[PDB]
Design a protein around this ligand. Structure first.
Ligand SMILES: [Cl-]
Ligand SMILES: [Cl-]
Ligand SMILES: [Cl-]
Ligand SMILES: [Cl-]
Ligand SMILES: [Cl-]
Ligand SMILES: [Mg+2]
Ligand SMILES: [Mg+2]
Ligand SMILES: [Mg+2]
Lengths: 295, 297
């Protein structure tokens, strides 16, 4: 089947640990430095986000607009004013910016007060991250590659994005580690069209994507029927019964983004295959305490 | 004229950040893995501990006995029973153990619940740490090298001198003199360091019971340290007051306080005017300094 799933499939005593944006709680998110830390912490699977620049470069960042809370200019000053769209910026323009730390006077910055504060850190190209990962050979981590389609609907552009992402995955020969992951289920269908050998992972989050109000099948049922290999529900949306239903349909379930100790502990007991977390060490330690492992 | 002090001296815009055992809140303490992480997190100074094995190897571990909360046997199970004395073990025997994580059931484990949990990590030789540090070249960190004497040698003056010589042989082999500071609670040992290596500054740890006879002494800690010939005074943070810090600065000393982890303590120490803060949480400390408009370079 899909050998990429071997790093994400759980067992009775095994719950996988996936580093969210690398390890946002410890290092600046979606940075090569953060990803290197995460792998050095023994984490075997990484989640990260891919968006496209104006000049067709896949880059690793979560927001479609560069957030003032996260971004400094070449002078070292936090950006102010309009948050600029990644889609309207060339790579070169993005590269001049610094995403090495957070502004501790902002609500977002105050969420992650223990994160290191680095300077002169660039938004990476997807190719840079893949090249890094490929160098580790058989120890390359599993990649939950979150595709973020430009919300400003053009199928041509969406197909171009998927094609650009795949060109990088293939260039670095990361097919055996790569999972295409998204809230955009139509985009996942396009992933499957251009890359039938890469598994697809379906993100879900209940309100308060599918029409959560009108749908008559369960989320796991909908994912299986769409052709997905993974169902990734927000952790407040998980029950042991829903996990069991997904497993009966042959799906792998990874939940996110679980950071509080009581929430990690609770999720580990539900049977989820793995936990996406901003705090991989914290998660490792809770799993060990419960007699579980992640390798 | 000690060039090593350039990375430990503060100034109006700067409070130095010293990584305690690397970054014990994030990575297993006193490990090459944790030291590399610390340097990748932009920390420019490291504190770590050195103890002698039975076969005369300076190794990087915090105490003269091995703690059950951070040590696993050759099968992977936590040590139980009486602590083992490092001076009575060969380096090979020590190396057979695993120090890659902490036992989360324990008091000590609960102190650092977010530390990564690694397997297959052994206690490194001092030489290995110095090789790693020297590899960064001009970006090599400043080193606050804590000599941890074993009270069993307290009447073995030759053995104590041998410890100092062994540590220095390593420092010299890796050309780390320009970054090394000799640091200890054992003030007599610091006298021996100065005699064997007058080129390396000496740093005097203190911690009040509430070393010297804290109940008997009549001069201040800063005065006692300046009089002993030290360049740094490193008091435990609960013992620090701004008046004691200014008294120390007036005597020409650098003041590094330790081990400061809670946000309100980090902030209060920055405000006393200390030259630097030794912390288990360098990122937390960095963020508080940035919030205060300060930096660590
Ligand atoms: Cl493919
Ligand atoms: Cl978030
Ligand atoms: Cl420095
Ligand atoms: Cl205990
Ligand atoms: Cl301690
Ligand atoms: Mg994401
Ligand atoms: Mg300026
Ligand atoms: Mg120490």
């Amino acid at each position: 089947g899909f050998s990429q799933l071997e790093g994400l499939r759980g067992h009775p005593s095994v719950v996988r640990v996936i580093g969210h944006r690398g390890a946002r709680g410890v290092m600046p998110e979606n940075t090569l430095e953060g990803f290197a830390f995460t792998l050095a912490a023994g984490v075997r699977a990484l989640e990260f986000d891919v968006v496209m620049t104006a000049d067709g470069v896949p880059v690793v960042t979560h927001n479609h607009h560069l957030a003032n809370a996260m971004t400094r200019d070449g002078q070292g000053h936090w950006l102010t004013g309009a948050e600029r769209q990644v889609a309207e910026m060339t790579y070169a323009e993005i590269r001049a910016l610094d995403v090495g730390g957070l502004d501790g006077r902002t609500v977002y910055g105050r969420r992650f007060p223990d994160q290191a504060f680095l300077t002169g850190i660039h938004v990476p190209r997807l190719g840079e991250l893949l090249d890094l990962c490929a160098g580790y050979g058989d120890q390359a981590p599993y990649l939950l590659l979150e595709l973020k389609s430009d919300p400003a609907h053009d199928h041509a552009a969406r197909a171009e994005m998927v094609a650009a992402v795949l060109a990088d995955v293939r260039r670095y020969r990361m097919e055996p580690r790569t999972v295409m992951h998204s809230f955009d289920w139509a985009l996942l269908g396009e992933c499957r069209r251009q890359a039938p050998d890469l598994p697809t992972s379906y993100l879900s989050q209940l309100p308060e994507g599918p029409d959560y109000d009108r749908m008559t099948e369960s989320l796991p049922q909908a994912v299986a029927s769409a052709g997905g290999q993974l169902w990734c529900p927000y952790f407040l949306d998980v029950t042991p019964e829903l996990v069991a239903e997904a497993h009966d349909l042959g799906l792998i379930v990874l939940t996110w983004t679980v950071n509080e100790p009581e929430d990690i502990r609770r999720m580990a007991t539900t049977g989820v295959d793995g936990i996406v977390t901003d705090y991989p060490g914290r998660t490792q330690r809770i799993l060990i305490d419960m007699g579980l492992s992640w390798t």
